[PDB]
Every structure is written in structure tokens, then in C-alpha cells.
Amino acid sequence: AKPKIDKDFKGKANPDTPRVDKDTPVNHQVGDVVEYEIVTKIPALANYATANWSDRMTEGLAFNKGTVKVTVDDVALEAGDYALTEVATGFDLKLTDAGLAKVNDQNAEKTVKITYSATLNDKAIVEVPESNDVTFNYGNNPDHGNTPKPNKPNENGDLTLTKTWVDATGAPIPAGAEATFDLVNAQAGKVVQTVTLTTDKNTVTVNGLDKNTEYKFVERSIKGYSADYQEITTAGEIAVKNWKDENPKPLDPTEPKVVTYGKKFVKVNDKDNRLAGAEFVIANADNAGQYLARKADKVSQEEKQLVVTTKDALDRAVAAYNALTAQQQTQQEKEKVDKAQAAYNAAVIAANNAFEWVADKDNENVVKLVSDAQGRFEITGLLAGTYYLEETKQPAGYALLTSRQKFEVTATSYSATGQGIEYTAGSGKDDATKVVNKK
Numbered sequence: 001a002k003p004k005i006d007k008d009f010k011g012k013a014n015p016d017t018p019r020v021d022k023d024t025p026v027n028h029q030v031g032d033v034v035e036y037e038i039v040t041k042i043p044a045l046a047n048y049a050t051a052n053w054s055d056r057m058t059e060g061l062a063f064n065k066g067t068v069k070v071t072v073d074d075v076a077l078e079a080g081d082y083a084l085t086e087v088a089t090g091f092d093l094k095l096t097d098a099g100l101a102k103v104n105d106q107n108a109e110k111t112v113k114i115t116y117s118a119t120l121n122d123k124a125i126v127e128v129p130e131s132n133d134v135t136f137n138y139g140n141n142p143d144h145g146n147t148p149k150p151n152k153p154n155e156n157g158d159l160t161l162t163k164t165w166v167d168a169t170g171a172p173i174p175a176g177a178e179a180t181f182d183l184v185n186a187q188a189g190k191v192v193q194t195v196t197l198t199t200d201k202n203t204v205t206v207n208g209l210d211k212n213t214e215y216k217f218v219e220r221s222i223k224g225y226s227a228d229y230q231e232i233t234t235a236g237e238i239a240v241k242n243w244k245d246e247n248p249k250p251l252d253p254t255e256p257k258v259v260t261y262g263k264k265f266v267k268v269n270d271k272d273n274r275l276a277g278a279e280f281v282i283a284n285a286d287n288a289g290q291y292l293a294r295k296a297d298k299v300s301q302e303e304k305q306l307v308v309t310t311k312d313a314l315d316r317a318v319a320a321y322n323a324l325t326a327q328q329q330t331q332q333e334k335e336k337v338d339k340a341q342a343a344y345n346a347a348v349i350a351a352n353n354a355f356e357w358v359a360d361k362d363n364e365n366v367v368k369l370v371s372d373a374q375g376r377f378e379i380t381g382l383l384a385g386t387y388y389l390e391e392t393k394q395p396a397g398y399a400l401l402t403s404r405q406k407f408e409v410t411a412t413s414y415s416a417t418g419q420g421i422e423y424t425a426g427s428g429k430d431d432a433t434k435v436v437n438k439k
Contacts, residue, residue: 001043003041003136003138004016005039005041006018006039006253007036007253008255010035010037013038013113018253022256023254025259026259027258027259027261028259028260029383030121030354030381031119031295033064034061036116036117036132037113038115038134038253039112040053041109042109044108044110045107046104046105046106047104047105048104049100049139049140050095050141050143052094052095053093053134053135054134054135054137056089056149057130057150058187059123059130060120061121061258063088066086067117068084069116070082070115071113072111077102078098080098081095081102083096089149091116093114122350122352125212127259129187130187131188131255131257133148133186134255135148136250136252138250141246142168143243144226144243145228145243145247148216148217149229150215150216150232151216153209153210153213154235155236159183159236159237160205160206160237161203161204161206162238162240163175163197164240165225165244166243167244168244170243173244175197175200176224176244177199177222177223179220180196181194181195181220182194183195183217184215185213186213186215186216187214189254189255192215216238222242225244227242227250229241260383261384261410261413262409263382263408263413264376264378264419265371265377265378265389266374269436269438269439270439274375275375276334276375277322277337277393278370278371278391278395278398279369279370279371279393280368280377281361282367283404284357284388286404286406289388290359292355292387293357296365299351310343310346313344314370317339318337322396334373335373337373338373341370341372352380361392376423378414382409384409384413385408385409386406388406397439399438399439417430417431418430419432420434
């Protein structure tokens, strides 16, 4: 008789019938608190020496420390019944002897519920899912196994797996068996590749991966050994330790996915020329309504000051740029504006830790998008829906738009072609919406 487990969003966990649409990311806006729930069913008359839950999340999700709650049969556990250790990227919850007593030697199946939350942060990339990963390591012997720790490849796209073998004591031993791993994209949860270590090898390297994706090596269960994934210390390196614990294979549920959307724009004129220095804010109605702003209690003074200094530097770049004749506006000049605007965008994405809707569009926290010398500007970290661009400052030599421009944020609105114009000329995909100005 085996334990059963499932992890999903609050209210949806179900070890018997796991949610079927699970792999499909659920849309959230940056700053949203994602509430998770782990449900475990422990068999009657169990005699486990170890019952450990471990969870590690991708970087776009920040584990909210102090939010962990755990119950057995809808009855909270006493503090001495478990040891909870928290890290930036997740936690470990280990039953103690007091805790194990509450799930062992029971006349009936015990239900263990663990809840907690994470915050979708500014590192989440639009349309790229973020995820958690829970594992339940247990057995009648002490178990040293835990959940895989996601990692990025190194700058060159290389990711190295290093394997060690130890007995129940921690003492090193020859390879106990061939070890097979699935290299998994930890964001989307899709298997990328299968690697195996023969007994004469302790490393393998995978090449040509995306430097901005988080991967993990998930060891295919090895009879008698538990996988102890070491803490991540550097990009491109993953270390796993095989303990000869002689326990059952871990439980590894499917996990939900979360995601934010976005929209890209290009400032152009009648003849499709691209215009620098146009400033826009976002509203939630064709007129009146409120404006998109970053939350004050979620942004530090340094982040707000970065938005200000980068904005000022951008303004001067634009001024210099506009003072130039048409022929003087070369690729190098345009490059200067594009550069200033990038530093501004990064500063804005970094300060945009959470959103609210405010009435005063001149509020310092209101999100202001500024077009660069390629006319590009974009918004990221949104819920799908209908928004309205409102121009607040026109590009030099142009009339201020008299109407708000309605735009739709969707699951593919940020990447889909057919939208009207190439965000960046030569990309091959018209993945931006045109915003037209009049002389």
C-alpha cells in the first residue's frame, strides 16, 4: 500500500483525481500571491522512519517565508512534530518522531495537508511559465532524498551533471548502478533530453541549451537509492548524491504552472517612420477610468530613484536626438536613444513589483512607457484583458493623440505575428501593434 500525493493551487489538490488541465499555465499579474496546496495520503498501519516534503521553485516565483501551514486530518500539527527549513527558492518540511507518530500506526488512511504561497516577481518573463516542484521522500529507513533544484546553463549554454554515491552512513561507494536522468525544462515541465551515467562515469554535460531557461536533472528511480540534489551554487552545474537508503521510490506529483502576459507597440507616423520620445500610460477604459501604477508598498526608494534617474537620462538622449537634422540621425545616434531607453525599461520592470489602478495619471508610481529610436515600447506582467493606451507626451513635431488606443492582452499577444508591424525591423515576425502619430 503506497502513499498518494498531489500538488495544485489552493482548493484543487486531489491525490485521487489530479487536475487534468494542470500543465496549462494559469495567468497572473506580477506581484500576485500564488497559493499552493499539497495533499498527501498515508496508508493505514504505516511505519515510516522518514516523511519529508521538499519544494523548489523557478526564479520567477518567490517563496513566501512564514506562510507554511500543515495539518493531519484537518488538525494543525504541533511545532515539535516537524522541522521546517526555508530558503529563497522553497522549503523542506520533515516530520520528527513526534510528527511521525501522528501518521504511523494509524487504523485509517491519514490525510496530510500542507499549504503556503509564493509571489510572482519581476524576474518572470512574459509568456514563459514559472513553476514549483515538490517531492515526497519517505520509507521505513531514514531517507536522504529531496526535490530537484532547478538551474540555468552557463553563459555558453552548457549544463553539467555530477554524481556521487554513498552508503546509508554517508560514506562513498562505487556506482551502485547505471543512473538515468531526464533533463527537464523546469519552467514548462517538458522533458528535453535523456542522459545516462554508466558505472564508470560520474559526470555528463549537455550542450546548446538556452542560457535563460531553468532546467533540472530528474533521476529515474534507482532501486535502493535515494536522490539528494545539492543546493545550487553556480550556473551550469548540478550535483546529485545517491544514498543507499533502500527505500521506495519518491512520490513526485505534477505541478501547476503560472504565467504573465504582455503587449508590444511601435510608435510610427503616416509613412511608417519610427518615432522616439512618445510617452504613454495605460488606462482601464476608453476614457475617464483609472491608470496602471506600481504599488508603493512593494517598491523601495532605490528602485523608485532608479526609475527617475534613468528617465532623466532618457529625456536628455531624446532631446539631443531631436535636435539633430534628419541626415544626422544615424544608426549610432538612434543607438544612443535605444540604449537610454533600455536602461529605463529595465528600471521600470524592476520597480513594477505589483500593480494597482489609480485616478491621478501624474502620480509618480503610474507606469510610463517611452518609445525609443525604433519607436518600440512594451508592457509586461499583465492579466489578459482590454487596456487602453493614452499618450501623455507626443514625439517632437507631432500632435498629441486625441483618442486612447484600445489593445488586447492575451496568451500570445506578446509573441504572435500578424499584429501589424515588426517590433524590431528584420525579425520576420510582425509581433507589435502600430501606434500612429500625425504631423
